[PDB]
Design a protein around this motif. Structure first.
Motif, PDB file in Angstrom:
ATOM      1  N   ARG A  23       0.845  -1.186   0.000  1.00 43.62           N
ATOM      2  CA  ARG A  23       0.000   0.000   0.000  1.00 43.62           C
ATOM      3  C   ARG A  23       0.899   1.263   0.000  1.00 43.62           C
ATOM      4  NH1 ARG A  23      -4.369   0.203   4.715  1.00 43.62           N
ATOM      5  NH2 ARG A  23      -6.025  -0.971   3.641  1.00 43.62           N
ATOM      6  N   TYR A  24       2.248   1.138   0.258  1.00 43.33           N
ATOM      7  CA  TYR A  24       3.168   2.276   0.266  1.00 43.33           C
ATOM      8  C   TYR A  24       3.132   3.010  -1.058  1.00 43.33           C
ATOM      9  CZ  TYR A  24       7.144   5.417   0.356  1.00 43.33           C
ATOM     10  OH  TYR A  24       7.924   6.553   0.248  1.00 43.33           O
ATOM     11  N   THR A  25       2.728   4.278  -0.991  1.00 41.21           N
ATOM     12  CA  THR A  25       2.658   5.189  -2.115  1.00 41.21           C
ATOM     13  C   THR A  25       3.746   6.235  -1.899  1.00 41.21           C
ATOM     14  OG1 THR A  25       0.330   4.749  -2.341  1.00 41.21           O
ATOM     15  CG2 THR A  25       1.130   6.790  -3.276  1.00 41.21           C
ATOM     16  N   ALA A  56       3.963  17.058   9.135  1.00 36.43           N
ATOM     17  CA  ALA A  56       2.748  17.211   9.937  1.00 36.43           C
ATOM     18  C   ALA A  56       2.216  15.861  10.412  1.00 36.43           C
ATOM     19  CB  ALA A  56       1.682  17.933   9.127  1.00 36.43           C
ATOM     20  N   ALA A  57       1.422  15.835  11.500  1.00 41.31           N
ATOM     21  CA  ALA A  57       0.861  14.574  11.998  1.00 41.31           C
ATOM     22  C   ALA A  57       0.000  13.912  10.925  1.00 41.31           C
ATOM     23  CB  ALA A  57       0.032  14.817  13.237  1.00 41.31           C
ATOM     24  N   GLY A  58       0.247  12.638  10.669  1.00 41.81           N
ATOM     25  CA  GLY A  58      -0.467  11.910   9.637  1.00 41.81           C
ATOM     26  C   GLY A  58       0.131  12.027   8.248  1.00 41.81           C
ATOM     27  N   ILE A  59       1.274  12.722   8.101  1.00 40.83           N
ATOM     28  CA  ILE A  59       1.895  12.874   6.781  1.00 40.83           C
ATOM     29  C   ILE A  59       2.622  11.606   6.327  1.00 40.83           C
ATOM     30  CG2 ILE A  59       4.203  13.889   7.142  1.00 40.83           C
ATOM     31  CD1 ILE A  59       1.492  15.320   4.727  1.00 40.83           C
ATOM     32  N   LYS A  61       5.504  10.021   8.423  1.00 39.98           N
ATOM     33  CA  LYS A  61       6.844   9.947   9.016  1.00 39.98           C
ATOM     34  C   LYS A  61       7.217   8.489   9.383  1.00 39.98           C
ATOM     35  CE  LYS A  61       6.123  13.052  12.109  1.00 39.98           C
ATOM     36  NZ  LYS A  61       4.677  13.325  12.395  1.00 39.98           N
ATOM     37  N   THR A  62       6.366   7.852  10.176  1.00 42.51           N
ATOM     38  CA  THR A  62       6.508   6.498  10.679  1.00 42.51           C
ATOM     39  C   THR A  62       6.464   5.494   9.537  1.00 42.51           C
ATOM     40  OG1 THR A  62       5.413   7.315  12.691  1.00 42.51           O
ATOM     41  CG2 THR A  62       5.522   4.921  12.365  1.00 42.51           C
ATOM     42  N   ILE A  63       5.594   5.692   8.531  1.00 41.26           N
ATOM     43  CA  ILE A  63       5.528   4.779   7.383  1.00 41.26           C
ATOM     44  C   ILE A  63       6.806   4.852   6.553  1.00 41.26           C
ATOM     45  CG2 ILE A  63       4.339   4.294   5.193  1.00 41.26           C
ATOM     46  CD1 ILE A  63       3.078   3.154   7.962  1.00 41.26           C
ATOM     47  N   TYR A 210      -3.093   6.246  -4.258  1.00 43.93           N
ATOM     48  CA  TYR A 210      -3.507   5.695  -2.970  1.00 43.93           C
ATOM     49  C   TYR A 210      -4.909   5.115  -3.042  1.00 43.93           C
ATOM     50  CZ  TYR A 210      -4.365   4.822   1.893  1.00 43.93           C
ATOM     51  OH  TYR A 210      -4.676   4.196   3.071  1.00 43.93           O
ATOM     52  N   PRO A 241      -1.572  11.626   3.894  1.00 49.05           N
ATOM     53  CA  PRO A 241      -1.921  10.210   3.705  1.00 49.05           C
ATOM     54  C   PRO A 241      -2.863   9.641   4.764  1.00 49.05           C
ATOM     55  CG  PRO A 241       0.396  10.588   3.248  1.00 49.05           C
ATOM     56  CD  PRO A 241      -0.110  11.813   3.945  1.00 49.05           C
ATOM     57  N   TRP A 245      -6.393   7.680   4.131  1.00 44.62           N
ATOM     58  CA  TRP A 245      -6.776   6.424   4.771  1.00 44.62           C
ATOM     59  C   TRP A 245      -8.140   6.528   5.480  1.00 44.62           C
ATOM     60  CZ3 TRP A 245      -7.767   5.115   9.846  1.00 44.62           C
ATOM     61  CH2 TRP A 245      -7.996   3.753  10.066  1.00 44.62           C
ATOM     62  N   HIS A 335      -4.039   6.436  15.935  1.00 45.59           N
ATOM     63  CA  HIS A 335      -3.158   7.564  15.732  1.00 45.59           C
ATOM     64  C   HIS A 335      -3.314   8.495  16.901  1.00 45.59           C
ATOM     65  CE1 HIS A 335      -0.989  10.674  13.411  1.00 45.59           C
ATOM     66  NE2 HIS A 335      -0.499   9.621  12.758  1.00 45.59           N
ATOM     67  N   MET A 336      -2.322   9.340  17.131  1.00 45.77           N
ATOM     68  CA  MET A 336      -2.383  10.318  18.209  1.00 45.77           C
ATOM     69  C   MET A 336      -3.393  11.429  17.885  1.00 45.77           C
ATOM     70  SD  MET A 336      -0.050  12.752  16.684  1.00 45.77           S
ATOM     71  CE  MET A 336       1.688  12.649  15.865  1.00 45.77           C
TER      72      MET A 336
HETATM   73  N1  LIG Z   1       3.393   6.549   1.914  1.00 47.42           N
HETATM   74  C1  LIG Z   1       2.291   6.021   2.441  1.00 47.42           C
HETATM   75  N2  LIG Z   1       1.582   5.127   1.713  1.00 47.42           N
HETATM   76  C2  LIG Z   1       0.420   4.681   2.201  1.00 47.42           C
HETATM   77  N3  LIG Z   1      -0.192   5.007   3.342  1.00 47.42           N
HETATM   78  C3  LIG Z   1       0.543   5.884   4.047  1.00 47.42           C
HETATM   79  C4  LIG Z   1       1.774   6.409   3.683  1.00 47.42           C
HETATM   80  N4  LIG Z   1       2.244   7.257   4.671  1.00 47.42           N
HETATM   81  C5  LIG Z   1       1.310   7.237   5.585  1.00 47.42           C
HETATM   82  N5  LIG Z   1       0.241   6.441   5.262  1.00 47.42           N
HETATM   83  C6  LIG Z   1      -0.981   6.306   6.034  1.00 47.42           C
HETATM   84  O1  LIG Z   1      -0.865   7.162   7.151  1.00 47.42           O
HETATM   85  C7  LIG Z   1      -1.180   6.454   8.363  1.00 47.42           C
HETATM   86  C8  LIG Z   1      -0.340   7.011   9.484  1.00 47.42           C
HETATM   87  O2  LIG Z   1       0.867   7.619   8.960  1.00 47.42           O
HETATM   88  P1  LIG Z   1       2.200   7.914   9.856  1.00 47.42           P
HETATM   89  O3  LIG Z   1       3.427   7.421   9.203  1.00 47.42           O
HETATM   90  O4  LIG Z   1       2.052   7.259  11.258  1.00 47.42           O
HETATM   91  O5  LIG Z   1       2.322   9.475  10.121  1.00 47.42           O
HETATM   92  P2  LIG Z   1       3.027  10.280  11.298  1.00 47.42           P
HETATM   93  O6  LIG Z   1       3.931   9.284  12.074  1.00 47.42           O
HETATM   94  O7  LIG Z   1       3.734  11.427  10.635  1.00 47.42           O
HETATM   95  O8  LIG Z   1       1.973  10.771  12.337  1.00 47.42           O
HETATM   96  C9  LIG Z   1      -0.974   4.975   8.055  1.00 47.42           C
HETATM   97  O9  LIG Z   1      -1.888   4.178   8.803  1.00 47.42           O
HETATM   98  C10 LIG Z   1      -1.229   4.883   6.542  1.00 47.42           C
HETATM   99  O10 LIG Z   1      -2.461   4.329   6.080  1.00 47.42           O
END
Ligand SMILES: Nc1ncnc2c1ncn2[C@@H]1O[C@H](COP(=O)(O)OP(=O)(O)O)[C@@H](O)[C@H]1O
Ligand SMILES: CC(C)c1cc(Cl)cc(C(C)C)c1NC(=O)NS(=O)(=O)c1cc(C(C)(C)O)co1
Length: 472
Positions: A23-25, A56-59, A61-63, A210, A241, A245, A335-336
């Motif tokens: 699912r990584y875009t 930003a939150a939800g961008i 970072k973690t993925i 996506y 992203p 989702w 998510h936070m």
């Molecule tokens: N490149 C990506 N491809 C697909 N989904 C992504 C991608 N980056 C983030 N997401 C979506 O974002 C959600 C949370 O992203 P996350 O990495 O935790 O952001 P952050 O840590 O910046 O708050 C994931 O559950 C996912 O569905």
């Protein structure tokens, strides 16, 4: 390389999924924060040892940090540059628990007795992926000291991470820190010649990608992306992203029913409420108590006893389905932003705590910035604004609505006690509250208007507020 093979095998298995990775875009990344390619992050423009990723939150970072781990372990990323990549999930690192850099590395390993003295042998071949600096529970200031130079010395988490960030501990080891823009203030003063990169999220084309990856039926994906194109707000909001989702997941429940697809959402609050309504009641209070407990007591991970205390017996099938995620006895919100949502909702429920106490610790790293708690309850408090409205207290919404206007009046025209709320952050707050009678009264408190536009989402939010201050 006897252990390197064993280790990369573990990394290929742990980072296999988002929590598959099909699912990584691709994300938009910009250096001099100029699109950078991941392989070239540590290639100099002398050598690049620290790389900061703002986002930003939800961008994502973690993925992107997990995609970096998986790609490296597959032999694609930094094949010749690093022997070891250690993923440090800041959400789990205690700032008060005394630990050594050795234990920190040993926690990233599958076996109980790793060859730590062999791993530490070539420090330039190590890359530490510190994920979510903003997620470090508690305070984290520059005054922390004395700085540590022994990887085997047990120091508290703040001295440990401060020494690793300032490049005192393993000075030639590479560092990748990802953070929310808000926390950048704390981090900037530890950083030694960092290379800054900005995570910009999805392009209009990779926003569509996506949607087509998510809806495995092209006919569903096309009709689901058509709703986003018809809605300017959802189209704009979908560079994030997480928003993609959230929208997609809600449009899946609506897809099951014979009812024509439609999402009339205009605000982040309305998007989160549309999502909450898809997964729908009695356990909506317990969720709020648990989230607001974690917001005030710096708890991002909730042990089985915390859910027991908050009457979540219930979380087995209902909450775990799409509102909770099991990890590693230890559960956290999806998510936070979702934690901050229930934290705000907690304040507006008919039986809630004092809203004034929250605003006292806004923008403070210790409390957690409280950006989404405030920003969400500006939109939730909205009198114009669901099935959830019946549960929300019609009366206490007006008590909070008046306290928010007094706060925005103070922040609008006062000597900065903190960086936050920035004028743009106040515009995001005001965008959530759409009531023109509130937004007009709030725009009168601004002495000067500061345009600091970065995204087309910033253009949307700010143009809305600016339009609401004509003053004849
Ligand atoms: N490149 C990506 N491809 C697909 N989904 C992504 C991608 N980056 C983030 N997401 C979506 O974002 C959600 C949370 O992203 P996350 O990495 O935790 O952001 P952050 O840590 O910046 O708050 C994931 O559950 C996912 O569905
Ligand atoms: C792109 C940002 C503004 C965003 C938009 C929406 Cl519609 C939804 C979300 C969350 C709810 C998913 C977020 N994300 C954050 O707001 N993240 S943040 O780190 O708090 C932050 C604060 C800032 C400014 C405003 C410049 O101060 C930038 O990033």
């Amino acid at each position: 390389k006897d252990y390197r093979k064993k280790y990369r095998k573990y990394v290929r298995s742990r980072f296999q999924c988002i929590e598959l990775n099909k699912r990584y875009t691709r994300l938009r990344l910009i250096k001099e924060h100029s699109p950078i390619k991941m392989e070239l992050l540590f290639d100099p423009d002398e050598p690049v040892h620290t790389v900061v990723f703002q986002g930003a939150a939800g961008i994502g970072k973690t993925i992107l940090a997990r995609k970096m781990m998986l790609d490296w372990a597959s032999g694609t990323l930094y094949q010749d540059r690093f022997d070891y990549l250690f993923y440090i999930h800041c959400r789990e690192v205690s700032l008060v628990t005394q630990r050594s850099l050795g234990d920190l590395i040993m926690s990233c390993c599958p076996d109980p007795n790793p060859p730590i003295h062999k791993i530490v042998r070539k420090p330039s071949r190590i890359l530490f992926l510190m994920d979510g600096f903003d997620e470090l529970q508690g305070a984290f200031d520059e005054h922390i000291g004395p700085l540590c130079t022994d990887w085997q010395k047990a120091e508290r988490g703040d001295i440990l991470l401060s020494s690793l960030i300032r490049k005192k501990l393993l000075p030639e080891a590479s560092l990748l820190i990802t953070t929310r823009p808000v926390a950048l203030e704390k981090l900037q003063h530890l950083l030694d010649h960092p290379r800054h990169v900005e995570i910009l999220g999805f392009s209009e084309a990779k926003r569509k990608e996506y949607f087509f990856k998510y809806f495995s039926d092209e006919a569903q994906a096309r009709a689901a992306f058509s709703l986003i194109q018809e809605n300017e707000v959802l189209f704009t909001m979908c560079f994030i992203p997480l928003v993609c989702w959230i929208v997609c997941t809600g449009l899946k429940q609506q897809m099951e029913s014979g009812k024509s697809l439609a999402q009339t959402s205009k605000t982040t609050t309305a998007v989160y409420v549309f999502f909450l309504s898809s997964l729908l009641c009695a356990h909506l209070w317990g969720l709020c108590s648990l989230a607001a407990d974690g917001i005030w007591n710096q708890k991002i991970l909730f042990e089985e006893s915390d859910l027991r205390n908050h009457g979540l017996q219930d979380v087995s099938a209902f909450l775990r389905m799409n509102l909770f995620q099991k990890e590693v006895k230890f559960y956290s919100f999806i998510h936070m932003t979702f934690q901050e949502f229930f934290a705000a909702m907690y304040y507006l429920l008919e039986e809630s705590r004092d809203v004034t106490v929250l605003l006292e610790n806004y923008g403070k790293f210790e409390k957690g910035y409280l950006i989404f708690v405030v920003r969400f309850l500006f939109g939730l408090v909205n009198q114009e604004r669901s099935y959830l409205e019946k549960k929300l207290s019609c009366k206490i919404s007006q008590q909070i609505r008046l306290e928010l206007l007094k706060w925005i009046e103070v922040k609008a025209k006062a000597k900065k006690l903190q960086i936050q709320p920035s004028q743009l952050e106040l515009f995001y707050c005001l965008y959530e509250m759409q009531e023109e009678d509130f937004v007009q009264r709030a725009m009168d408190y601004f002495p000067k208007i500061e345009i600091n536009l970065s995204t087309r989402m910033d253009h949307m939010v700010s143009s809305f507020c600016i339009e609401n201050c004509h003053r004849v």
